[PDB]
Copies of this chain bind each other. A is one copy, B any other.
Amino acid sequence: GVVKLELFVVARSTGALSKEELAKVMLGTNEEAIELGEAAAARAKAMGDEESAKIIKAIVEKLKKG
């Protein structure tokens, strides 16, 4: 709900996920959300955006055991 949308907002503003991947984060399962979040954080690292990586990982942490 709110946590998947947090992930969505941060990942979209980072430009780290494609349209399909964002669609899956919004309409898919929680496991898919966790996996795309991990990919998003790694991509945020790769762009030099350490802050976004830290935010995405904290959100994924909330998303995980849930």
Contacts and interface: CB of A to CB of B under 8 A. Distances in A.
Question: Which of A19, A51, A52 has its CB near the most chain B CB atoms (within 10 A)?
Answer: A19
Which one of A10, A12, A20 has the greatest number of beta carbons of chain B within 10 Å?
Answer: A10
A55 interface: yes
> Does more than half of chain A's interface fall in helix, strand or loop, or is it mixed?
helix
Interface of A: 1-2, 5-6, 8-10, 12-13, 19-20, 22-23, 26-27, 49, 51-52, 54-55, 58-59
27 contacts: A1-B2, A2-B2, A2-B5, A5-B5, A5-B6, A5-B9, A6-B8, A6-B26, A8-B9, A9-B9, A9-B12, A10-B26, A12-B13, A19-B49, A19-B51, A19-B52, A19-B55, A20-B51, A22-B55, A23-B51, A23-B54, A23-B55, A26-B55, A26-B59, A27-B55, A27-B58, A27-B59
